[PDB]
Design a protein around this nucleic acid. Structure first.
Length: 141
RNA sequence: UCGGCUCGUGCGUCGAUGAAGAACGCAGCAGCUGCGAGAAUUAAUGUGAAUUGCAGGACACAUUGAUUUCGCACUUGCGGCCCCGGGCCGGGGCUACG
């Protein structure tokens, strides 16, 4: 099933290295999280088939500060947007190094040395893999 | 042929309040040209959305609104007088002949 897709996706825009798969599924758990509430059929203890973001008839008085132990869709979105804003701010940090052609007098370019200077996959995976390797070892043992 | 030459017309305005001329410097990226450390121009007015070889003006929509060097001497040499500030240094104003 996936062997055929392995070689074809690389050609073109450049959505290869399997990272295009990771972003699609990772963002999916974030974006379809909102759409889960209207489509959720399980209730547990409170009605959910009609959604929980707007439930004024069910609650109301109305306790807007509900228990966010399941479907925290109301509160986690508040905190996550803060993380999105802070990361992009630190993403733009870089030290610009003056650079010029060794033959032509004129335009000056800058070699950018990013603050991270390493793609997130090489750094975070090396810490993600060891965390996964630790867990599987303890589960087996 | 965005240059000359010739004729004609009107005007006919330089300078110690420092001229003509010279030097040096000024553009984000030599010359010519334009400018003077406010240096490829500031203000104002009119005009009105461009400048342009290249990305880079929030252009308040009341589109205010784009388009220096050339007192004594000429080596930056040496002063003097009066103030100001910092503790000798820096700044300002003076100091040619008739």
């Amino acid at each position: 099933i996936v062997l055929l897709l392995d070689e074809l996706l690389q050609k073109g825009y450049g959505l290869g290295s399997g990272i295009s798969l990771f972003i699609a599924t990772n963002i999916c758990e974030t974006i379809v999280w909102k759409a889960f509430s209207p489509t959720t059929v399980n209730t547990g203890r409170g009605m959910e088939f009609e959604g929980a973001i707007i439930a004024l008839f069910h609650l109301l008085a109305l306790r807007e500060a509900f228990y966010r132990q399941n479907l925290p869709n109301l509160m986690n979105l508040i905190a996550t947007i803060f993380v999105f804003a802070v990361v992009i701010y630190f993403q733009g940090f870089r030290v610009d190094l003056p650079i010029k052609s060794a033959r032509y007098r004129g335009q000056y370019n800058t070699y950018p040395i990013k603050l991270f200077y390493t793609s997130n996959i090489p750094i975070i995976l090396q810490s993600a893999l060891v965390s996964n390797l630790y867990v599987i070892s303890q589960m087996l043992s």
